[PDB]
């Protein structure tokens with residue numbers, strides 16, 4: 001099996017399993033100019049009719065942080081022309097939105113790259129946005145949430161398809177993306193967060209994963225099976241969660257007595273939703289009010305009390 | 318708060334949260350001679366009456382692997398004599414046992430160790446075994462499972478109470494254990510197995526975890542919160558998985574019709590229980606029969622066929 005089919009087989013597999021494209025007609029690619037983006041594009045133009053797409057276009061965002069960005073942008077317009085594709089370029093100063101909004105260069109650009117994409121989508125009439133997220137991004141992300149503290153959501157990471165976003169390379173490993181770009185002799189722009197190990201994701205990618213791989217070289221593959229199991233168990237619990245939530249709220253309060261003899265796993269999913277907080281301690285606080293009567297203060301004036309069959313928000317302040 | 322009250326309260330909290338001890342009278346301690354063993358022993362002797370324990374004793378296994386072995390065994394007896402405790406000591410040639418049985422060394426020791434402990438437990442009339450596992454073993458354990466492939470079970474790691482085994486320092490960090498020992502002026506044996514990054518556990522312990530704490534210095538406490546959550550979620554899934562295994566398994570079959578209209582999460586759970594295998598692959602091969610005709614060959618004669626309304630065996 002060659003590098004081409006090794007990627008295309010996984011993309012088709014993903015399509016089967018998740019129905020990545022099932023009616024969408026116009027696709028907008030979150031094109032960065034990077035290998036994964038280039039390979040993402042090469043694969044979609046090769047499957048354009050297979051997916052019954054009417055049009056595939058690029059959308060590049062110039063964060064204006066580095067100097068190369070000016071050059072990265074040139075590559076993208078060129079690439080688009082070599083492909084005879086439509087492309088929308090966007091220029092914004094993260095740094096000047098991440099300063100006048102208290103933001104890390106990163107987070108601020110994320111918001112902006114997306115705003116522009118949502119923009120390009122709803123305005124130009126595209127049905128969805130395709131991203132180049134791949135299996136290693138999911139490994140790093142998942143491991144980050146594990147590090148930062150989390151539950152199933154973080155362990156699952158992002159999904160192959162969520163609302164308006166589609167991630168065709170979800171099953172593909174970075175090395176497979178790399179091998180395919182070389183095999184087909186594609187050109188792209190290098191990785192210049194190439195080792196700014198000061199950022200967690202990058203520390204995980206360059207210093208953690210390589211160690212874990214010294215334990216299990218097929219970590220990514222082994223990692224994928226675990227996510228499939230968890231996604232399902234999560235889906236189920238979240239499903240049961242709504243069952244109980246509604247089985248439980250009255251308007252603006254929660255029925256302690258009914259929720260008191262329900263499974264802990266579920267009580268916690270319910271509280272989490274009632275209060276709009278995922279923090280473990282805040283959850284336990286509110287949970288304690290199920291047996292004990294009284295008050296608990298969470299944060300933005302989120303104060304909850306027990307009437308006595310009920311557990312509500314205090315209206316004060 | 319001092320290094321002692323710090324650890325003591327976490328043990329009292331684990332006891333309050335899990336009922337570690339609740340009728341046991343004679344505890345046998347899996348005593349390695351290392352810090353954790355030593356702090357475990359010191360905490361049980363101090364909380365003996367509180368837990369209503371009639372006796373606490375030490376069990377030390379000489380793996381015969383390291384050169385200090387003999388010496389350490391001696392320290393162990395002296396540690397016992399010092400606190401006027403019984404000490405049972407087992408010795409076996411792990412090394413050899415592995416070669417005449419096809420076992421690496423991790424497994425060999427493990428096998429003989431626990432075997433030795435269960436024998437003392439029975440021939441000495443002990444109710445349970447107290448191990449010195451701690452939160453950092455848990456964190457190292459769960460990362461090993463996340464690396465080798467796993468589900469909730471692996472992520473959760475060992476539990477505070479599992480059968481005959483007890484783990485009173487489950488909530489305690491290795492750092493707290495080390496401060497405890499210095500504070501109370503305790504003596505212990507050197508862990509000459511830190512090094513060897515060849516051992517995955519140590520590679521995680523020395524290379525992986527350190528990098529993670531540079532992202533979150535509170536990794537262990539944060540990991541614990543995650544475990545508690547995962548545990549109750551896992552409890553609910555297994556319970557719901559029991560109901561379904563009973564609502565669908567009628568004989569040596571599974572009511573496809575009923576099991577096909579239920580949650581994937583559960584299906585796999587039902588399948589896993591039915592076919593006795595747990596790996597993702599077999600379960601999914603078997604799982605397709607709920608939708609496609611045919612039969613499957615998993616292991617040693619483990620083959621299942623799909624009838625019109627039933628997924629039974631051959």
Ligand SMILES: Nc1ncnc2c1ncn2[C@@H]1O[C@H](COP(=O)(O)OP(=O)(O)OP(=O)(O)O)[C@@H](O)[C@H]1O
Pocket residue numbers: 029030031032036037059060061062063110113130131132133137
């Ligand atoms: N300059 C860009 N213009 C448009 N889209 C981009 C650009 N950079 C990245 N993307 C899109 O976002 C995806 C993820 O990129 P990257 O991992 O660098 O962002 P992150 O912010 O680091 O990740 P996430 O997007 O997971 O936060 C890329 O694969 C691509 O689909």
Ligand SMILES: Nc1ncnc2c1ncn2[C@@H]1O[C@H](COP(=O)(O)OP(=O)(O)OP(=O)(O)O)[C@@H](O)[C@H]1O
Pocket residue numbers: 346347348349350353354376377378379380423427447448449450454
């Ligand atoms: N030589 C020994 N004699 C008796 N008990 C021991 C000995 N070594 C270890 N133990 C017990 O086993 C527990 C776990 O030890 P450790 O985790 O270092 O070994 P492992 O091989 O990693 O064990 P597991 O695989 O059970 O974690 C120790 O806390 C102690 O209670």
Ligand SMILES: N[C@@H](CCCC[NH3+])C(=O)O
Pocket residue numbers: 350351352353495505506507508
């Ligand atoms: N260096 C640590 C660990 C030594 C081995 C402990 N069993 C200490 O002595 O505190």
